[PDB]
Structure formats: structure tokens, C-alpha cells
Design a protein around this ligand. Structure first.
Ligand SMILES: CC(C)(COP(=O)(O)OP(=O)(O)OC[C@H]1O[C@@H](n2cnc3c(N)ncnc32)[C@H](O)[C@@H]1OP(=O)(O)O)[C@@H](O)C(=O)NCCC(=O)NCCS
Lengths: 19, 162
């Protein structure tokens, strides 16, 4: 938390795709 | 078909492959701010395992960060380029990644997934039910109330691939 260096979390909307 | 670990070592060869991976991640995760992908992929605490075709073309990869003393790693981004999907590369990459994590003495893989990815990660053996205590990741992994944190236990003597 309140990292600003930490690891990472994806962005999987839902696979029928466009953003 | 090589699965090599790539890190920001400042050479033109590794840099081109890390930018190519970052470009696959932004095109396959359009909800993600592209500047946030650049920042994690080129962060000194993150490493990337790429799927290299003809030892020069990146067609996929997984960006992760290890918490070596805590023995867990959080998967940052995972993607395979559109024209190479449904060819079983994503599963071969996860198996090669779990094999490398077993050699790195990493016991758990954690990843935030929402919507469809809950299902893709459940097929790669990640669960919404944790075995690892919440206080083990708190202060290292960010607690978001907006996503589903999934974990995969890496047993020291399970073989990973087929
Ligand atoms: C998630 C991802 C890496 C999977 O890679 P892949 O190369 O397609 O993986 P595989 O070919 O090993 O997948 C095999 C299985 O997935 C299914 N599958 C793969 N791509 C699919 C798609 N676009 N739509 C529906 N099903 C799909 C196949 O039907 C197959 O059947 P099975 O699960 O019973 O074995 C890829 O779809 C991708 O780059 N997605 C966009 C990025 C993303 O959302 N990443 C995760 C969050 S960061």
C-alpha cells in the first residue's frame, strides 16, 4: 500500500474487448 | 520458443524486448494507463518472463515482483499478443513461470483479477480462498476492496508443464 513502486494489478475488463 | 527472464539491465537488446512486451500489455489491457505499465515493467523491483519466438520476437509475457524474504510474488500483467492467442502459449508461460518460482523458493503467487480473469486464473490453479494469512501480504501487496485477490500455492516438488 501507498507504495508507488508495488507489484501490480492487471486490467482484465472481460475478454469480448475495446477501451 | 524460449521463455527467458528479462530485466532492465540497460542494453539495447533487452530494452527493445521490454518495450515490445510493454506494448503487448497496453494493447491487451486497454483499461490500464500505459504510463503505469511502463513504470512497473521498468521498475528495478519487477522482472518479466517473455515468450520469445525466433529468439527476437516477443509474443507474450508475465511481469511480476518477488518479495523474496516473504516468499510470495504478485503477477503485475500477463498477456499474449492477439495474433498468437489460443495456441496454448498462455498456459505454457504460467507453467514455466511456476517452475521458475519453485526454483526461486517462492511459495505463493498472488494476483488481483476481476471479471473474466477470475476464470482464467482459476484454470491456472489460483483460488479466491486463501491459505496464506492476510497479515503475510498486508504492507507488501496493496489491499484494494475493488478487485478479487487470487493466490496459487507453489508446492516445492510438483512438476509444472503437462
Ligand atoms: C489471458 C491470456 C494470456 C491467455 O493466453 P492464451 O495464449 O490465449 O492461452 P491459452 O491458449 O493457453 O488458453 C487455453 C484456453 O483458454 C481459452 N481461451 C484463450 N483465449 C481466449 C479468448 N480470447 N476468448 C475465449 N477463450 C479463450 C481456450 O478456449 C482454451 O481452452 P481451455 O481453458 O479449456 O484449455 C490471453 O487471452 C491474453 O493476452 N489476454 C488479454 C490480457 C489479459 O486479460 N491478461 C490477464 C490479465 S493481465
Amino acid at each position: 500500500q501507498t507504495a508507488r513502486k508495488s507489484t501490480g494489478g492487471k486490467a482484465p475488463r472481460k475478454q469480448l474487448a475495446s477501451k | 520458443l524460449d521463455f527467458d527472464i528479462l530485466t532492465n539491465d540497460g542494453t539495447h537488446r533487452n530494452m527493445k524486448l521490454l518495450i515490445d512486451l510493454k506494448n503487448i500489455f497496453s494493447r491487451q489491457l486497454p483499461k490500464m494507463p500505459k504510463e503505469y505499465i511502463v513504470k512497473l515493467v521498468f521498475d528495478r523491483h519487477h522482472e518479466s518472463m517473455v515468450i520469445l519466438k525466433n529468439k527476437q520476437k516477443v509474443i507474450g509475457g508475465i511481469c511480476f515482483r518477488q518479495y523474496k524474504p516473504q516468499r510470495f510474488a504478485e503477477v503485475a500483467f500477463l498477456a499474449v499478443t492477439a495474433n498468437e492467442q489460443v495456441r496454448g502459449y498462455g498456459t505454457r508461460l504460467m507453467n514455466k513461470f511456476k517452475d521458475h518460482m519453485q526454483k526461486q523458493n517462492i511459495e505463493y503467487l498472488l494476483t488481483y483479477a476481476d471479471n473474466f480473469a477470475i476464470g482464467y486464473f482459476k484454470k491456472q490453479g489460483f483460488t479466491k480462498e486463501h491459505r496464506m494469512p492476510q497479515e503475510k501480504w498486508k504492507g507488501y501487496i496493496k489491499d484494494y476492496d475493488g478487485g478479487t485477490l487470487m493466490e496459487c500455492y507453489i508446492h516445492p516438488y510438483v512438476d509444472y508443464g503437462r
